[PDB]
Structures are given as C-alpha cells and as structure tokens.
Design a protein around this ligand. Structure first.
Ligand SMILES: [Zn+2]
Ligand SMILES: [Zn+2]
Lengths: 85, 1350, 69, 54, 50
C-alpha cells in the first residue's frame, strides 16, 4: 500500500509539474498584452484628439449650377442612431 | 362700395423704383435716366405695352403734353436744357420750394379754423392744469418747476405748429394727397373723365393723376415724378419733420436738440442730392452713432470711443465709395455730422433716434435686395464640432433643469450613453440638478443623451394660431403670376406658352374653406417627408416697407401647407419646449419683464448708504444670424426636440427645403432681367434669384435659434466662470456681466475691474458664436459700463431714456384703418400723447397738445371731407361755429366726444372705470370754463339710445348712447361674421350659429334682468360660457384690410348699411349736435347734480338714466371706481413746510419720500441707494382641490360657477343656475363641480409692444409707505394712488432736472374724500327668468370637453 | 523504512515546491487587475470616438436622418 | 510515530494551502473570461465603425 | 495514516480536477491573438484618417 501511497503520488506530481510549466508561459503572453494594450491606449489618444479638432465645411453653391443638377441627395428621411441608441 | 375701400392714407407698402420708371417710360415722360437705371424695363417692347392700358397712356400722354406746353425746354434732348429731372432721394433739399400756396384754399381754411377753435379754450386748459397742480401738490408750480422760461399754452402750440418751417410744405403735400386720393377713387369708380389736375402754381407746376404727380420748381429748375406710394411717403415724412421740430420748439426738455436736428437734416439733404439712394446708408449709420456717443461717456478708458471711432470709419467709407467726396471733404462732412451729437445729455442723445424716418426710405429694387441675401446665404461657412457639441451639452443640461423645477422635481425620460460616467448615472438615478460647472467638464456625456418623449403636445393645442392670416406664395408653376401682365406677356408670347394664372388666395381663407382639416394630418406634410417631394412648393420674398437698411428689406412667403406646418411647429415649440428655459429673462408679461430689465441695469449701482458687485453690459444685434443659421448647427437640437415631442421629423425643415428650391424676390414691377428664364428650377444665382439658400428665414424657426443662442451664452458664461443674466430676444440680446470688486475701490477702478472681468467672457462668447458659424463684428457688439439696449430702448444708469421724438414723429392726421372715422384718429392721437407723457415730455405740454391735435383732426376732417355728401348742413353747422368744434373735441369719448385722453391718464396707465374719469374731466373743464354746465345737463338728460341686453354685458362701463362704436370695429365684426358663416373647417364646425345674437341676448337677459344688475359679472360669465367662447373664437380672426375687402366682396353689404357705413362721421356729428349746440330742456331732479358732486355719484346717475329703457329704474352695481386724481388730495412738503391735510383731521395717506443729493449720471456712491421702483402689480387661490392639466374648457367653468355664487347667490337654486351654465362647456357632475370650484369669495372679476410707463429716473430712489392706509377694488385703488404719487415725483423733477438739492415728501392723502365708499355685494338674487335654451357645441373640442377629468 | 520516511520527506518538500511555483502563477494575476481596470478607459474613450464619428455622418445634409422612435 | 503524525498533520496543512491558493487561480479565471468577453465587444464595434469610415 | 493516505487521494483528485479546468485557462490565448490583430487593424485604419 505505502508503495501505492507514494508511487502514483509522484506521477501526478510530474503531471502537475508539467501543467505548471504550461501555466508559466500564459503569464508571459499576459505581460505582453498589457504592454500592447498600453501602446493601444496611447494611440487612442491622438486619434480622439485629432477628431476633436476637425473642420466641417458646407460647400454651398458657389458655382451656381442649376438645382436640377444639384439634386444629388436622398429624399428619404432615414433612421440612424446617434450617441446613445 | 368703393367709398369704404379707400386708397391708403399712410405708407404701408415698399417704394418701388421700377414702378415709377414704368409710369414715366409708359407715357414717354421726359427724363435723363441712364440705360442702366431702367434695368429690365429698357428692353421691354414699350409700343405693345402702350397699345394696351389705353386709358393710362391717355393720361400719361396728356401730362407729358402739358409738361411740354408749360415748359418748352423739356423738349430739348441730351440734357442740354437747364431743367433737371430728379428722383425721390434727390428731391430732398428742394421740397421746401414746392409751395402751391396760392390756388389752394382748403389748407388755409383748415389752419384758420384750428386757430379760431384753439383760441377759445387755451385759457381754460391752462386753468384746468393749474387746478390739477393745486389739488395734487398744494402749490401752483407742479408743471412749471422744470421750465421755471416759456410756458407754451394750447394757443402757442397751435401757433408754432402752423407757423413753423415745413408747415407750408405739409399743407401743400396734404392737398396733393387729398387730390390724388380723389383721383384714385374716381378712376376706380370708372368715371374716365377729368382725371388730370393742374394747379399750375407760379414757380411750382404740379400735375396730379391717379397714377403719378409731376412737380416742377422754377426757382431750382427741377422736375420730379412721384407715384402714389412715394407721395404718401413724402407727406408722412414731412408731417414727422413738422411734429419733431414743433415739439423741440415747444418743450424746454427737447429744445437743445432743435437746432442740431435742423442742421443734421440739411446736411443729409445735401448729401442725398450728391448720393441718392445710398444716403440712407449714412442714415443707418447714424442710428448706431447715437449709441457710440453714449459709449463716449463711459468711465472705462479702454472701452471709450471704440464704437465712435469705428462708426466714423464706416461713415468715411460710405462717403468715399462712389468717390463723391475726397478724404478731406469726407472728414469735414463727418465732423459736421458728429458736432450735432456732442455736448448733450444722455437722454437727449438717445432722443436723436427720431431722425431715422425723417429722411424717408430708399427706393427698392428686387435685384439689389436679393444680392444681400445671396451673399449672406449660399456662402461657405466653417463650424466647429466641439463648439456645437458643447452648446448641445449645455442645451441638454438646461432642458433637464427645465423639466425639473417643473414636472415635480424629476428628470425627464432620458437614456444615458455608454460614456456617461458613474457620476452622471448617479445624477440621473437621484434626479439631481446638473451643475453648469459639471456640465462644462464631461461635455462628452451631458450631450449624447436622449431626452425621450417628455411632452404630450398636440398640433391642435392652440386654435388662435390657425386663424391668423399669413401671406402665402403661389405654387412653383404659375410663379410669374406676381409680375405685371404687360411685362411678361411678350416673353411668354415668344415662348409659345400660356400666361400664368394670378394668385390671390389667402391662408386664412383657405383654412376656413377646407371641408377636411386635421392638424395631425397637416403635420404629416413634414413628418412623412412629402415636403421634399412636393413639386408645387414655392417660397418667395417680397420687399419690406418702412426699412432703410439693406438687411430686413424682404420678407418671405411660402405655400399653404408649408406655412401651416411652420405655424404648428412654432406653436409647439412655444407651448412646451420654450417654457423650459429661463436662463433668458424675457417673459410675455411686460411688468415682470421691465422689472427684470431694471434689476439687470441696476446690478452695479450700489451706494454708500467689504466686497461690492460690478456690472458691465454687452448688447449684440441678432438681425443677420437668421441668414447665418446652417443645418449642421441646428440638427442635434432639432433631433432632441423631436424626441422630446415624440415626432420623428418636424423641425430641421426650413433648411432642408431651402437647399432644394430656388427662392426669388416677388415684385410685380421687377420681372427677371432675362426674358428666356421662365422656370424657377433652372434659375441662376443672379438677378432676383437665390439658388439653394442654405440658411433660415426671419421669424421662421426663431424659437430654436433663440434656444441655441441661450445655450451658447450659458456655455460662454460657464467657460469664463462669470455670472451673467442674459435677456435674449429675437434680433437683440443683452448680457449683464457680473463681477465681485472691492467696495472701497474708486468708481472708475470698479468699472475697470468689471470690464477686465467681462473681457474673458466676451472673448469666449465671440469664439462660441464663431464656432456655430456666425461671425461677430464691431457693428453688432456694443460694450458699455453704463447701458445696454433692449427692444430699441436703452437702459442708462438705472433709467430708460425718453426717445419721445420718435413717438411724436409717427403722429399724423388720419388712421389707416378702413373706417377712417374721426373717433379712431383722435384715439390714435391720444395714444401717442400718452406715449409722450410716458417718455418724459412735460405733462402740461402733452395735455395741451392732445387738445390741440384733437381739434386739428376734426377740423381737418370737416374741411377735407373724405366722401362727398349731397347735404352739407352738418359740416356747415360745424365749420361756421368753432365753439361747437371746441366743445365736441374737449368732451370725453365715453360721453360721445373725441377727447380720448383723460387728466388721470397723464399719471397712471391703469384707469379702471373710464366713465368716472370722464365725468371728473368734464367737471374740471366746467369749473375752469372750457365747457359749460348745460353740456353736462344735456348729457344727463340725453335720450337713451338703441341698446340691448347684450350691449351692456359685452362692454361694461359703456352708456346706451349711439355711435360710440366706430365703423372700423363694425367692419372687423362684419368680416369675422362673413368668414365664420362661410367657414366649413372641422374645428369650426359648431362654432358658428345662426341664432348666436339672440342667444347672446337671452343669456345676457338671464344674467342681468335680476334684482341687481352687475355688468362685470355678466361680462365674465358670457366670456366663460359656450356662446362667449364662440365669440372669442370668431374674434380670433385677423380682420385685416384684405380680409375686409374679401368679406365685402363675397358678402355684399346692403344698401342702407352701405350708406350708414359711408356716412358714419356725418351721422355721428349730427347725433352729437343735440348736446353741444344749445341748452336742451331736461328733467328737473337733474338740478341736483353739480360740478361739486363726486364723479362716482354722477356716473351712477348717468348709467341709471342712460339704460332706463332696459332696466326700468333698477340700479347698476359693481362698475364705479374713483378717479385717481379726484381721490387724492396731495401735499408736497419741502423744507419747513407741513402737510395741511395731516394737520387737519385727515390721517389716511400714501407716503412718498425722495432723498437729497441724487445726482444722476454720476458716482453711484454719492447718491442714495437705488432700487426697482413700483411699476405695478398684476394678478397674483387655494381651491378645495388643485386639478392640474385642466383643459381651457374646465378652468373657465369653475370661474363662471364661482362668480355666479359670489355674486348672484349661495343657495341651491343659485347652484342649479351655475351647474347648467358650466355644463355648456364641461361635463362635470354637480358634486365634482362644486368641490373643484375655487373659493367664491372676493372674486377679482378681472377680464377684457414694450412701452414703459415712465423713465424711472427719480422713481428708483423713492420710498413708499401705505402704513397709514387701510391697504379687490381697494387694492387697485391703492396701486393707482402709488403710481400717481410716483408720476408726481417724476414730473416734479422733469428730465431737464438732473439733481435734487433737497429732500421732498409727498403725502397724497386719500382719506377725507368723497370718492371712497363701502363695498357690499354677494346678496342672493333669483334669476327672474327661465334658463335660456343654450345651444352648445358638444362635439367641438375647443368649446366643450367630454372628459375633463381622468 | 527510514528510506520511506525520507521518501515522504521529499514528497512533502516537493509539494512545498509546487507551492512556490504556484505562487508566481498567482501573482501574475495582479497584472490582470490593471488590465481590467484600464480596459474600462479604453471602452470610455472608444465610445466617445464612436459617438463623434457617428454624429458627423448624421450631419451630412444630403441624407435625411431618422431617429428611432 | 508521533513525529510521523505531526508530519502527516503538516502536509494536511500544506494541502489546505494548495487548495486555498489554487482556488484563487480559479478566481483569476473570472475576470480573464469577463474581460475576454469585454474585449469581444471592442473587436466588434471597431470593425463597425470601419465601414462608416470608408 | 491510512486515513491520510485516502485523504490526499481526495485532495490530489482535486488537483486533477483543478488541472481539468486549468487546461481551459489556456484558451484565453486564442483571444489574446484576436485582440492583437484587432488593434493592429485599428492602427492601420487610423493611418487612413491621419
Ligand atoms: Zn399728511
Ligand atoms: Zn369724489
């Protein structure tokens, strides 16, 4: 019995040792993401910043082209969500 | 019929240059017009046009032949003649030359009659004023303290009005206008004969036709042609010039201005001759320069002279654009112009806003007007998203804070965006106020938050909006129907296309004539998207009258459906969303409005009696923003308003439709220049076309624009951390920048610190308004440490300056209303005189002026008869006896005269009972000597008129004396009745009833044929009944000239009526002949009434005798109210004086105190503390239960029910007479009505733009105390007493006086007086009649509500 | 015999090693704490950006915008 | 034998510790799945705006 | 003793079980790659905007 007591205690042990090994790497992948996501956070800043400073221009009709030609817009009220929704 | 539908008396239409060009080219009239001046008219085949309009060419050829005959040199071509042909803006410096003095006798007879009539009462008017002063102050110098100089009596006023400059010119142009209007009437009626008038005065040859007048002056060798509109324009201007110059000559307050004004006129007149139609630009600069001059006197160095210098640089630019004046000449002219604005008091400088309309108006061309709106619109405009989101975030914050403070302190239905932080979530959950300090940060969550449906708004909420006439444009096809047929006939002849169908339909008529009209379906034009696919849509502008600036010279008209949607949207915004913000202090109630304005202007005026508060005011003009509004800057606000209202797409319409339609300026005499462009879609952005306008239109969607501007103002205030109180209104906003300074600091340093604080907010506001895309220039923004501008009136150091000359400039000799009765005109003159009293001019002068001008009007109407009468017996009896004219003009209107201004009206706006005030005034005149006591006896003994039970109840305080109702009001009523009987609209289904008049009579008999007759309660109950609601709906109709014309056309007046309308003035004079001619034999007991008898007692007796046929001796109760002047026996205590009343028994008085050392326009520390004066107290219930959301039909029922009980009785029969009456407008049961009815105790019985009652100069330093008085009639009496005391203190120190070297006290004792009496009412009264069969509109929602309670 | 007790001796010691290894395994968890907390911001900024771009498209004058409900 | 039992008792303790520590590993699993779920939303909305942008 | 012998059996089984779930822990790696690719695509997409 005592043999049984110890013989398999060890095999699993090995297995658990093995699993542990596997567990180790995962954590590295982890630190890497942490840093990858930190870089992503820095990048998000510039984009949002630039979008904040944006120019919206209404071309208007300086040319004076007939409205017939100027009619290039949907005449259908369309439902699109904004902000919340 | 044509004798009622007369040509206009004054200017109500824009001046069209091409109309004059058409009339002068049509007859080949001599001219030196260059080809470019004619514009499109030069290419017209004028031979074909002359072939048609044969009568017009006959007349024009005749006048041309006569010009050639009298002056041969007009034949000479190439301008080799010395005669110069000039147009309107160039005839300015010559109009005095045209005299026509000889060969004209009517103006002379008019002047002599007015002189003779005035000479018989001037002495009496002076005695009246003296007696008023003695009985209101105890001293005889109440009105003469400021001037004592010269005291102008009525005789002096008439002399200086008739002997001033412009007097001969005014008489000449009045004669010209009278002749021209006779000619227009004759041409309408189709006489075809003698329609040319040739006065042929020496050195002034004038030929008048129904179309135009040719005027030639030999002294200057100048000939001009004037159309009818321009003739009305010239005569109105010249009357304004006469009025301003006279008033300046008379009033010692406006005396220093006189010479200056004259100089200014001359200079601009000469400038006009050099410039022409552009000189008005200089005029439009002057309206700004006045403010600049005020800004020249501010303590802050950095803000002194900026506006002055900039406006001077603009005037130089204007003088030097056409190179008329070199730089040196331009500088002189500028210096001459400015020297007239210097060395004047602040209100005299503000008084110079009268001269804007003293030089007339520019001649308008459609192309030039279209150019400005083409440059403003259709232009690239940059906008900043952040600025737009930040202002949307603050918009949402204000909307959330507005739903709260209402809706029981809870947030509106809202969904929070995924960014909303934990803090915003908590705030939503706890329904807590959003701090603007919070809102400034985190804007990325305050915005992006949907305020889901919050309002249950219905398009049919308000009925008054649908029944107001608005101009409607013709469909897109048939859009040239506006133009004259002659001009476009040829163009369509070469196009092989049919002639357009002319358009005349009106919006009100089209609504009224619709079998099926549902506002929920009317809005489906916009919600469903049909407005974008509709090919018959067309919007067009039309030239605006009485405008001297390029912007605002055109107003727009749209199609019927799109106008209906616009009015529904505006009503929806005003009813629900607009109430939710108050950051702006503008309110519908004028009293609180001026209270808020006065507090705003007195923010920084703190005295000595630590930190103090300082104010810097910033006023910006908002006229050009409407054209600068783009879709990007209104889309999120529109998108949240739509959510809140539940509609998917109602707003955002103005821009979306305008991008896809070509607008145009519609003038009948201004056709398109190119005869080949005959369709609107293809049009180019030139001439009169504006292709794809991207901006909004004036008035349209104004609520949303004001809402966004308020959001931007709050945003800028929060960014700069500065407290402000905006006053945003349409076209002008005022902001009172508030800061905290050191109390011990010097006044100049205090304002310097205030300006330094305001600089940051001004910069932030400029940046914010630029972000939403509306650039702010130096013209629009005006920064002052002393004053701001609201509703064209300035608020200078705790005062509103006078600007009385502007009011007197619009005082002419006839009212435009169709009837043109003498009563109407005298009422208009009286109203302008009241405005003059409120605007600082001497009250004695105002009273004399009112008497003089009422005399002047009647004499003018007598000697210039509008309609020819076969029998001239009445007009001869009046012309040959000026005593009759004086007696009738001095007689109060309520007694049958034309004196619509009472002595009490000089002091207090609110009157109460007009017949007591009228009796007071007639007593005064009798005791002075103006009128005789037999006139009063005749009025007492006058035979009762033709009155019905409805006539006593509809208008209480009115006697049963015929012809007190002007023809005008009758015409309005006839138009309203004709349109509603013709109305077929589903909303107006049950409103009209053929038995309306007899139902009114029966109900009025029910309420009034009782033991005691109480006309006030009858009026309230009628107006709250179903029949009264129907009358109110019928009264919502506009009743405009065009509407009156339509009504008279489709429903012709009967022959007798036609005559009684035509000869109303003659019948009125004949009716009054019985009381103002000789002492009539009267009943004897009338010897009891004396001039010493209290007015109230005489009013009671007169009402008892006048309605004797109706009432059979029963007395009238609930009407009488003491006259304000006769109730108070004042006494002014100066120095060692003491009050006689107080010292002799009397003990009831209203104490007024004005301190010593008040020097206006000086250091606020020196003068005593300032405060908002008593400007009046409006209506201010604890019913057994407060029903919220009560319909209009329910609150009405509970007030009727209530007043019946407080008045007729508290019994159960009395109750069975209130439940039935309320049942005509509600479906409540007896128990619910009884319990929901408010308290039937002390029923107020109250029932029925920016005009201040006074300058509030010395009234802001006064102390009031009614501690020695008893104290809802008594409340009104004591409020009137306080207002009278305020007016007395103000008139003691007139605007000429700017200092108080002594402390004054007023006691104004109201006790010890005849007028005060005990009040007894609420006695039980049976109905003495069965309940009338009241036909009720059960189905109609606006009259009856089947479910008033949930 | 004595060997067995030793075998157990090692048995326990090794078990005690698992402990050590396990420890580092655990600590790694903290890195997570931060990732979750931060990701929070990532989401906040992202959404704001989303709203911005979305709004601009909505602003386009040419295409009419319908709002749900 | 007493010493052996002490040792025996001890490992028990050690076991307990193994149990308590590893449970926390399970705990770490909670967020890692949750944040995993979170990031999922991100990858979605990211591409979502992609089309809008183009 | 023989008791403890069985005792650890349960606790080691727990280990076994723990080792059962742990294996699932690895799947996260799948995500880590997905989120790495997703931010690479966002940077490439912001490049356009810039
Ligand atoms: Zn007294
Ligand atoms: Zn009295």
């Amino acid at each position: 019995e005592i043999m049984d007591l110890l013989r398999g205690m060890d095999a699993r042990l090995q297995h658990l040792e093995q699993k542990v090994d596997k567990v180790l790497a995962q954590g590295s992948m982890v630190t890497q993401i942490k840093n990858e996501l930190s870089t992503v956070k820095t990048t998000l800043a510039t984009i949002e910043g630039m979008m904040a400073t944006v120019k919206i221009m209404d071309p208007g009709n300086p040319t004076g082209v007939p409205v017939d030609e100027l009619r290039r817009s949907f005449s259908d009220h369309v439902t699109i969500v904004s902000g919340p929704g | 019929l044509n004798e009622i539908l007369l040509p206009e008396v004054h200017l109500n239409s824009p001046i069209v240059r091409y109309k004059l060009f058409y009339y002068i080219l049509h007859g080949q009239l001599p001219n030196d017009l260059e080809p470019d001046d004619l514009g499109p008219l030069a290419n017209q085949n004028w031979k074909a046009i002359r072939a048609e309009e044969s009568q017009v060419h006959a007349r024009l050829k005749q006048i041309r032949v006569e010009l050639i005959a009298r002056i041969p040199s007009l034949r000479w071509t190439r301008s080799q003649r010395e005669i110069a042909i000039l147009i309107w803006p160039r005839i300015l410096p010559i109009l005095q030359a045209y005299d026509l003095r000889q060969s004209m006798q009517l103006p002379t007879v008019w002047e002599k009659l007015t002189q003779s009539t005035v000479n018989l009462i001037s002495d009496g008017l002076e005695r009246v004023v003296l007696h008023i002063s003695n009985q209101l102050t105890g001293k005889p110098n109440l009105f003469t303290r400021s001037r004592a100089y010269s005291i102008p009596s009525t005789r002096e006023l008439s002399q200086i009005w008739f002997n001033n400059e412009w007097s001969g010119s005014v008489k000449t142009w009045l004669m010209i206008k009278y002749r021209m209007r006779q000619l227009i009437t004759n041409q309408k009626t189709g006489e075809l004969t003698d329609l040319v008038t040739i006065v042929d005065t020496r050195s002034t040859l004038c030929i008048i036709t129904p179309e135009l007048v040719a005027l030639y002056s030999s002294e200057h060798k100048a000939l001009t042609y004037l159309t009818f509109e321009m003739v009305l324009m010239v005569t109105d201007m010249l009357e304004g010039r006469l009025n301003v110059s006279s008033l300046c000559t008379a009033s010692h307050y406006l005396s220093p201005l006189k010479k200056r004004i004259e100089v200014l006129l001359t200079l601009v007149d000469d400038l006009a001759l050099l410039m022409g139609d552009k000189v008005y630009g200089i005029v439009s600069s002057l309206e700004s320069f006045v403010y600049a001059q005020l800004q020249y006197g501010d303590p802050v160095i950095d803000i002194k002279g900026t506006f002055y210098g900039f406006i001077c640089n603009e005037i130089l630019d204007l003088l030097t654009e056409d190179n008329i004046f070199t730089e040196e000449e331009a500088n002189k002219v500028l210096l001459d112009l400015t020297s007239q604005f210097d060395n004047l008091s602040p209100d005299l400088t503000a008084e110079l806003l009268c001269i804007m309309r003293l030089w007339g108006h520019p001649t308008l061309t459609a192309s030039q007007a279209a150019s400005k709106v083409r440059e403003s619109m259709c232009a690239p405009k940059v906008l900043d998203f952040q600025t737009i989101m930040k202002t949307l975030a603050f918009f949402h914050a204000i909307l959330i804070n507005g739903y709260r403070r209402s809706h029981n302190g809870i947030w509106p239905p809202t969904t929070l965006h995924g960014n909303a932080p934990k803090s915003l979530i908590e705030m939503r959950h706890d329904n807590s106020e959003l701090k603007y300090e919070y809102v400034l940060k985190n804007w990325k969550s305050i915005s992006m938050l949907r305020i889901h449906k919050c309002f249950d708004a219905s398009p049919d909420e308000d009925l008054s909006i649908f029944m107001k006439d608005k101009a409607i444009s013709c469909p897109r096809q048939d859009w040239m129907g506006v133009f004259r047929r002659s001009l476009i006939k040829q163009r369509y002849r070469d196009a092989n296309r049919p002639l357009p169908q002319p358009f005349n339909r009106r919006l009100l008529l089209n609504f009224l004539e619709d079998d099926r009209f549902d506002p929920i379906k009317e809005l489906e034009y916009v919600t469903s998207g049909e407005y974008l696919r509709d090919p018959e849509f067309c919007a067009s502008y039309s030239l605006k009258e009485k405008e001297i600036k390029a912007t605002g010279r055109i107003f727009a008209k749209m199609t019927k459906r799109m106008r209906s949607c616009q009015v529904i949207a505006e009503s929806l915004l005003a009813n629900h969303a607009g109430k939710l913000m108050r950051e702006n202090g503008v309110v519908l109630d004028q009293l609180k409005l001026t209270k808020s304005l006065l507090t705003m202007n007195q923010i920084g005026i703190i005295s000595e009696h630590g930190f103090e508060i300082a104010a810097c005011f910033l006023t910006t003009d908002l006229t050009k923003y409407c054209l600068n509004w783009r879709y990007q800057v209104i889309i999120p606000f529109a998108r949240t308003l739509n959510s809140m209202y539940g509609i998917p797409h109602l707003f955002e319409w103005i821009h979306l439709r305008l991008m896809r339609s070509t607008l145009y300026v519609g003038d009948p005499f201004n056709p398109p220049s190119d005869p080949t462009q005959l369709d609107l879609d293809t049009a180019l952005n030139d001439d009169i076309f504006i292709v794809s306008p991207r901006g909004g239109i004036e008035g349209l969607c104004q609520k949303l624009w004001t809402m966004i501007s308020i959001s931007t103002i709050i945003l800028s205030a929060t960014e700069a951390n500065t407290r402000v109180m905006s006053m945003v209104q349409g076209d002008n906003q005022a902001i009172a920048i508030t800061t905290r300074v050191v109390r011990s600091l010097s006044h100049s340093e205090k304002k310097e610190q205030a300006y330094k604080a305001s600089k940051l907010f001004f910069e932030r506001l400029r940046a914010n308004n630029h972000g939403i895309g509306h650039h702010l220039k130096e013209q629009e923004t005006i920064l002052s440490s002393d004053f701001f501008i609201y509703s064209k009136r300035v608020f200078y150091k705790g005062r509103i300056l006078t600007q009385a000359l502007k009011n007197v400039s619009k005082m002419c000799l006839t009212a435009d209303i169709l009837g043109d009765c003498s009563q109407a005109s005298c009422s208009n003159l009286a109203t302008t005189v009241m405005r003059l009293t409120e605007n600082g001019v001497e009250k004695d002068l105002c009273y004399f002026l009112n008497a003089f001008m009422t005399i002047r009007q009647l004499c003018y109407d007598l000697v210039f008869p509008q309609t020819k009468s076969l029998s001239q017996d009445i007009t001869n009896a009046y012309l040959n006896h000026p005593i009759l004219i004086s007696r009738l003009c001095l007689l109060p209107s309520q007694l049958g005269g034309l004196n619509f201004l009472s002595c009490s009206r000089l002091f207090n706006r609110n009157i109460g009972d007009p017949l007591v005030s009228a009796i007071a005034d007639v007593k005064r005149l009798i005791k002075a000597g103006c009128l005789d006591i037999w006139v009063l006896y005749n009025i007492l003994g006058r035979r009762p008129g033709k009155g019905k039970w409805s006539t006593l109840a509809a208008d209480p305080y009115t006697l049963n004396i015929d012809y007190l109702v002007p023809s005008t009001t009758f015409l309005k009523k006839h138009a309203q009745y004709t349109l509603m009987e013709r109305s077929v609209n589903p909303m107006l289904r049950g409103v009209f009833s053929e038995n309306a008049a007899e139902e009114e009579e029966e109900l009025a008999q029910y309420l009034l044929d009782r033991e005691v007759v109480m006309p006030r309660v009858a009026h309230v109950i009628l107006a709250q009944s179903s029949c009264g609601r129907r009358k109110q709906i019928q009264g919502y109709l506009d009743s405009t000239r065009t509407i009156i014309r339509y009504s008279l056309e489709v429903r012709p007046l009967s022959a007798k009526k036609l005559n009684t309308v035509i000869e109303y003035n003659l019948l009125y004079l004949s009716y009054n002949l019985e009381i103002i001619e000789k002492p009539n034999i009267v009943q004897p007991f009338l010897n009891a009434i004396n001039v010493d008898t209290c007015s109230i007692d005489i009013a009671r007796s007169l009402r008892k005798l006048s309605w004797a046929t109706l009432l059979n001796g029963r007395p009238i109760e609930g009407l009488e109210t003491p006259d304000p002047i006769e109730l108070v026996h004042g006494c002014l205590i100066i120095g060692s004086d003491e009050c006689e009343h107080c010292s002799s028994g009397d003990d009831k008085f209203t104490w007024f105190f004005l301190p010593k050392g008040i020097r206006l326009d000086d250091d606020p520390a020196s003068n005593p503390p300032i405060r908002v004066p008593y400007i009046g107290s409006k209506t201010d219930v604890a019913s057994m239960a407060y029903i919220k959301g009560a319909s209009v039909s329910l609150k009405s029922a509970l007030r009727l029910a209530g007043v019946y009980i407080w008045a007729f009785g508290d019994t159960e029969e009395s109750w069975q007479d209130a439940y039935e009456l309320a049942s005509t407008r509600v479906n409540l049961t007896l128990e619910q009505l009884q319990s929901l009815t408010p308290l039937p105790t002390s029923a107020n019985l109250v029932h029925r733009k920016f005009t201040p009652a006074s300058s509030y100069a010395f009234s802001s330093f006064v102390h009031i105390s009614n501690d020695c008085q008893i104290l809802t009639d008594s409340n009104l009496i004591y409020q009137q007493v306080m207002i009278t005391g305020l007016a007395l203190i103000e008139t003691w120190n007139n605007p000429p006086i700017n200092f108080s070297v002594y402390e004054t006290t007023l006691h104004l004792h109201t006790g010890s007086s005849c007028c005060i009496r005990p009040v007894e009412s609420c006695v039980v009264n049976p109905p003495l009649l069965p309940v009338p069969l009241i036909n009720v509109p059960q189905m109609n929602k606006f009259v009856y509500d089947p479910e008033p309670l949930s």
